[PDB]
Design a protein around this ligand. Structure first.
Ligand code: SIA
Ligand code: SIA
Ligand code: CA
Ligand code: CA
Ligand code: CL
Lengths: 133, 131
């Protein structure tokens, strides 16, 4: 009867998140989320970052939909929006480093790293949920 | 790496299943027992927060709390006593209708007590398996 998210996706605050069980490079992951009409995960709330951060820690490193592939040092979400000042706090100390060599962002432990996009990692999709009358 | 069974949500070392249908309280207990889980027991505030918002999207939802053993004492389905640190979650004006509304539900932003005969959504919880 009342189903908020696709089967095996988790509901959180009006959206549905899918946690990959396997690992892929950054671009593939984008493609993988695209294939289910979703986006490699974009963060725009702290409750979200807290929920996503904890899941990832139990699995391991996990890609999010953030990168500076358009322009070194500028960090864009796949929807084109710029990284907000309110989120810089999520960088781990010593991150981001290796600018121009590590162009994609991952959850790592308790914060974000930038990394070689070529590496395979777990990933996460996000799309909007569907209500119940 | 699979933390929880298919269509179950991982949270802080446990697994959660959200029903798509509604059942009276005792049935819901049964349903949980069918999959080696319990009608949900809260023991953390991050947990209470997650469930609360999830229920909101669906509708009133049962948890594994009741005073069926003894009017006015609220025990979890596992027999454990309700903690002082969690009393804050009763909505204002809850618990009421004591001795007539014997089971606890998520309702809005806190907990109500309700007639156990009512059909409501439910949530099961059981421990996860790591990677
Ligand atoms: C492999 C190595 O020797 N040092 C690595 C350090 C260490 O990880 C940190 O000093 C502590 O973890 O930082 C990187 O991983 C990073 O995030 O870009 C790359 C770098 O090559
Ligand atoms: C006259 C009277 O006793 N009324 C009832 C009230 C009201 O239900 C609440 O005040 C909410 O309006 O309180 C009880 O729930 C309670 O706490 O035991 C039962 C009680 O029988
Ligand atoms: Ca880095
Ligand atoms: Ca009531
Ligand atoms: Cl399974």
């Amino acid at each position: 009867l009342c189903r908020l998210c696709p089967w095996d996706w988790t509901f959180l605050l009006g959206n549905c998140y899918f946690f990959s069980k396997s690992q892929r490079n950054w671009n593939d992951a984008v493609t993988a989320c695209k294939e289910v009409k979703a986006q490699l995960v974009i963060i725009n709330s702290d409750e979200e970052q807290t929920f996503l951060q904890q899941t990832s820690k139990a699995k391991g490193p996990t890609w999010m939909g953030l990168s500076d592939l358009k322009k070194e040092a500028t960090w864009l979400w796949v929807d084109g929006s710029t990284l907000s000042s309110r989120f810089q706090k999520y960088w781990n100390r010593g991150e981001p480093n290796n600018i121009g060599e590590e162009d994609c962002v991952e959850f790592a432990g308790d914060g974000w790293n930038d990394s070689k996009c070529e590496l395979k990692k777990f990933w996460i999709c996000k799309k909007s949920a569907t209500p119940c009358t």
